[PDB]
Amino acid sequence: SRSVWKGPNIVPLPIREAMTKGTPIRTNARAATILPQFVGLKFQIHNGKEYVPIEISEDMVGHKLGEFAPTRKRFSYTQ
Amino acid sequence: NENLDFYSDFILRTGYYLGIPLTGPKPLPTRRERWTVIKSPFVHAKSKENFERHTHKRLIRAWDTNPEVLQMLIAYITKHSMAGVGMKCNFFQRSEISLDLGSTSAVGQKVLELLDSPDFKKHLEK
């Protein structure tokens, strides 16, 4: 849990183009912190193999992009 | 210890002729370093070999001597030093309270340069 006094984990992203054009933002920066500006924008977040499409709501601010792109498949046994 | 003691004896002889009162060699506590290894290269972590290293120490003190004579002692014993012996010398100089003519970091400089660059000045604008 990053100390609040340090601020958000800001990463270089193309937000201006996604706000003037509406294009999805494809990124591997799973550590990035969802800033309040991101709300409404569409992100394609790498999960190690594919890019998961996700639109950001107001209940996602503060969390990190990686939290919404699961990297493992649910476990199953050959019962 | 063998070269250490032999060399210490030589220093006392050098000092005597130079007129330097010397005391010692006082033996200081020997330091022991230890390392434990597993003898096998890959597995078998149940058989472990022990290794150690001992640092032997000696203290020779000089008294009531002028700085110039003390430097001659250090120069001579340096010229004729033995293999595997190290030497640290603490010099003590008594001085007057007030003397005549007396007896900026890299990071700070770069910070000033960075805070003047456009990538930072573009924000500091008030």
Partner: protein
Amino acid sequence: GNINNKLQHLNNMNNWNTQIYNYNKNMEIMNTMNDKLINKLLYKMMTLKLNNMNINKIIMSKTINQHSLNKLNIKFYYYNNDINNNNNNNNNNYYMNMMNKLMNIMNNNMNNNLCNILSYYYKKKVTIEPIKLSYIYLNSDIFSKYISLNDMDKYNNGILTNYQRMLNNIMPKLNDHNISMNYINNINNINNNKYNNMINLLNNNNNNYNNNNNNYIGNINNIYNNMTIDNIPMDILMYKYLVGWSIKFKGRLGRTSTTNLLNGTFNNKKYLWSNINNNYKLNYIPSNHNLYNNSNINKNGKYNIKVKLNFI
């Protein structure tokens, strides 16, 4: 007595190939790494060629790096068999053979001596002292390297019956027990010569109050009468006679095979019959025993030559 005399015991400092102590531990690690790298480099400078069919291989031991406060001395033993001009003439007095050319670049060459190059690598004065050994069985390291690298045609199809025989007639079979007892008698004689000298110098009187504090017995000459450099030094020197030697082979010379040659004694009786005490080098190797291993590559692959010598 044995450990209090420079001629009767091996200084423990000699058990290590890098003889150094630096307060700055990082500089000590760096010096140690530099000694291994230079040792490898020197091994690559020992093979010389005059013509395609004249390749002279000098067998070099591991280096002894003596780090003092002011200089570094690199001491190593080398063996060279002069096969190009092994005559009874003095033609060698008018040219420098390849081995002399190699040894003269260590210190003598005024422009590109290896010492000056190394002096910048180490940031201290450096000297190199090559010491020539005339036999290959006087140093365990040289002996192993020779077999491994030069005697391959003798043990690559099994150990030749002549090769083994030569490795068993190298030294006459000295009687260790009498040599050990001769050494102990000489020590007793020297010890009894000094006690008699003092007893006589005291009984002859050479302040009664001062005759209870001082221990000065008298003139140095009388105390050491008949104890000179011509009779004391060579009689007390240790590890002077090879009394045992074991040469082992192993590897593929389609399965690995090991052959062991054992000849002589691998113990010292000077320690049993006398108060003299043995010392273990690196705390696990007896002082008398010197063991070294050298490996090489053949058509099948890696094979190791393990030689052990017992000098008493």
